[PDB]
Design a protein around this ligand. Structure first.
Ligand SMILES: O=[N+]([O-])c1ccc(S[C@@H]2O[C@H](CO)[C@@H](O)[C@H](O)[C@H]2O)cc1
Ligand SMILES: O=[N+]([O-])c1ccc(S[C@@H]2O[C@H](CO)[C@@H](O)[C@H](O)[C@H]2O)cc1
Lengths: 490, 490
């Protein structure tokens, strides 16, 4: 428990610093088939394979923010947030996913109203163009980001970005092309736990007929090409002195398992395959050496024209930080054979150190362990190794477990002191990091709202605002939310 | 030019610290076919391909130390040296290279007399068992260290090692199984510049029917297996509290070419492929990750019983230091394709930095540039990453160029102030390194005598003592030698 002289204060951090909360379309919008919205990959996945989501639920309603957005802004204003990060639904804007299919007027209106309302209350909008919701039409036509032609998906995504620039560019000054490329590719086509549900034969997912060692890279390579085409388009027709564009990386901190230098090497291969995978190409135009040396031919190459577009394609970078892991070395030998794309790093990511203890206290769900130190390590790598570009912690928080056999009574849910302590500790390390020369610019608490947690369904509540599903999704502030309120209000 | 107060004094190092000079059998011995000595790979190479040595010479006489050894010890005593490092001629001991062939009595006698004489003058002998001189009989029988079975050469070397332990074990308290494995394998089977003269088709060497991307590793792997087997035998039937055994690595310091982090990575792959190649295996029982990930299947795997034998097989380690290089990154791509085994490091070793200036001033020959800092960097890596074992700089010095076109007059030859300066500087860094916690134990000036410089023939003089080839190889102390004399006597 933090002492008083230790609780973050707003006068720490300059006036520029922005504080806000974040959400993602499919996770909170609901109205999956209303006002012309086209079906998405997740609509498709949840409806055809509820056994694949922990509690057999879907997000046909989610937090119902499509109809309750006005309330969301109200809560944001009341908390005194500076910004709000949300994503746009590709299929709600382009039902068929293509330029051919046409632009859905109702989709444009919804985001238009939200953006205007946000700005009216002094809340700066940070827009995530793509947050895993792929138009099923594009998925059936060519597998989406699996597009073997590496063209279709790029042209389509680009247009989708264009439409967004065309209708929201005048009000939006902060764009994020993609969210968590690594999580998306590794989970959708590696362990098949996400959206499509594909994985290598022998593995356990809905469609075990893919190749966990190849598809994640194929998809990731297309995303990168798409990113480039998009930023090139943004900089040539929409960029303004006061507007910025980038993308957000998912990343866990990596600490050497033991004292051996072999683990130090394992740690580096880990940062490389998790963060470097997508970060290095947007900064220098190619993948990390370790990956090219290990994944070999399974990692596509970029033409020279592509290398140019990629390198330096951002004005800011988003970082989604939740935990860390101990990286333990795995030697190269004729025995060991990678199974998942992530095993190409020749290192196991342990939760418990050699002393049998967890890297940090368990926050409740099956993977979040508190280790704010890891967020400092990350900010120092961005500063000393990667040009120290503007950083935004676009995601950070924990998920309070709430199941059938172990229901979370509302009163407990609102007294999320564990979440409060977590948020505060990380905010503090940013103040530390800034003084250490980090170029961090803002912090977004992940989940303004309790919502659909992908394959976890509604078994976890990540919001700072509670959402009562038993009474038409009416929201209530938790202590974390209340603390954030006085923090921005003091 | 080095000022006084900066010039190293003997009282700077502990009384424990040892100082000496070094040589190698083929390079000085001579009497290539006397008293039953068997033909070696170099006898064979020089006699059949005089065009492959700069001045078309051989070492049939060399410094004729086989007949003048008594004089060599005298010089050593006069200089007040603590030790003398020399190597034994495998074919002079085992004419046919095998146990079957028998032991040559005269060969035993020569080394026996030398060792006794050395000890009589208080000079401790550091014996290098193998210094590139492979019996031609084995070379012809199965290609020597190219032995595809990874059995014959290991078995024959071990016996050779045994014979040495049997006849000199009682007097010798310091053994070195191999000398510069890297230089030997890379030059003999990589560039084909050494002994056998083998290289890949497409390259230029005596026998371009080999494979520069494989044979060096094959030979290196056998050497390692051989080393392990020799030390195991030593430790079980010969080791004594006061006796030690190890090997000597050739190694150039590596400095990042530029500021990009990519060069830092290139630097590490360089230390790895140069030093790590043989060092890591004797310290932890296996080649470094980088190499296994880059040379792939071209680098043989060690059994488990072999990993155990290899790990820890040494009580001390020898280091041969001459210069350093800037390591410049090379990306993996469909264009670049390694040709030489050393290319597997994906890094060019530049002599001049980004500013067009050499890493250090030139010492005369085609490759020695003065960079004492590199030695410090090397001793720090040994101290911090590899267990900080007792280290001996078994080689260090420069080569005064003396050709037919630009001959070096004896007067200039003796006034080797450039060498003296160079020797003094490195001895100082040793003192700096000790103060930084290095476990260095002694220093050996490379070349007590001017001698045959392999493919360079007699175009370079490395000795601290001059050898007049026009007057029966009579020796004269150069200024460097004289300085070393007063250094040890104060
Ligand atoms: O180990 N894991 O199973 C896992 C690791 C990272 C993430 S990223 C993060 O996961 C949140 C919780 O599932 C979700 O709300 C956001 O959309 C995402 O950015 C998801 C799941
Ligand atoms: O790049 N090169 O040309 C080169 C580098 C290192 C060495 S090692 C050293 O080379 C000396 C002169 O070639 C010789 O006297 C000794 O036997 C060896 O230890 C030989 C040649």
């Amino acid at each position: 428990m933090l002492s008083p002289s230790e609780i973050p204060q707003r006068d720490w951090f300059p006036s520029d610093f922005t504080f806000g909360a974040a959400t993602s379309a499919y996770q909170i919008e609901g109205a999956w088939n209303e006002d012309g919205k086209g079906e998405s990959n997740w609509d498709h996945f949840c409806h055809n394979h509820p056994e694949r989501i922990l509690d057999g639920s879907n997000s046909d309603i989610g937090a119902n923010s499509y109809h309750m957005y006005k309330t969301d802004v109200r809560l944001l204003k009341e908390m005194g947030m500076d910004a709000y990060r949300f994503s746009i639904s590709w299929p709600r804007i382009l039902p068929k996913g293509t330029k051919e299919g046409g632009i859905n007027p109702d989709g444009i209106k919804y985001y238009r109203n939200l953006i205007n309302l946000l700005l009216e209350n002094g809340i700066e909008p940070y827009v995530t163009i793509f947050h895993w919701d792929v138009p099923q039409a594009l998925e059936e036509k060519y597998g989406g980001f699996l597009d073997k032609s590496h063209k279709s998906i790029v042209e389509d995504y680009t247009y989708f970005a264009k439409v967004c620039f065309d209708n929201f560019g005048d009000k939006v000054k902060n764009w994020l092309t993609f969210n968590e490329p690594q999580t998306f590719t590794s989970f959708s086509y590696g362990t098949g736990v996400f959206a499509p549900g594909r994985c290598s034969p022998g593995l356990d997912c809905a469609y075990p007929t893919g190749n966990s060692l190849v598809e994640p890279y194929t998809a990731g390579h297309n995303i990168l090409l798409a990113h480039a085409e998009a930023v090139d388009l943004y900089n040539k027709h929409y960029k303004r002195d006061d507007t910025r564009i980038g993308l957000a990386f998912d990343v866990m901190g990596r600490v050497p398992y033991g004292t051996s230098f072999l683990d130090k090497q394992a740690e580096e291969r880990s940062w490389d395959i998790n963060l470097g995978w997508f970060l290095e190409p947007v900064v220098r135009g190619d993948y990390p050496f370790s990956m090219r040396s290990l994944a070999r031919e399974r990692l596509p190459f970029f033409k020279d024209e592509q290398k140019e577009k990629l390198a330096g394609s951002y004005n800011m970078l988003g970082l989604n930080y939740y935990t860390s892991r101990f990286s333990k070395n795995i030697d190269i030998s004729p025995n060991y054979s990678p199974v998942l794309n992530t095993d190409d790093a020749y290192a196991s990511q342990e939760v418990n150190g050699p002393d049998g203890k967890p890297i940090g206290p368990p926050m409740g769900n099956p993977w979040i362990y508190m280790y704010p130190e890891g967020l400092k390590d990350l900010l120092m790598i961005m500063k000393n190794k990667y040009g120290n570009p503007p950083i935004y912690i676009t995601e950070n928080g924990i998920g309070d477990v709430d199941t059938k056999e172990t229901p979370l009574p509302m009163e407990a849910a609102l007294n999320d002191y564990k979440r409060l302590d977590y948020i505060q500790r990380h905010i503090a390390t940013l103040k530390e990091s800034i003084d250490l020369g980090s170029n961090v610019q803002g912090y977004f608490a992940w989940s303004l709202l309790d919502n659909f947690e992908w394959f976890a369904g509604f078994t976890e509540r990540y919001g700072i605002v509670y959402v009562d599903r038993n009474n038409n999704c009416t929201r209530y502030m938790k202590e974390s939310a209340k603390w954030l309120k006085e923090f921005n209000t003091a």
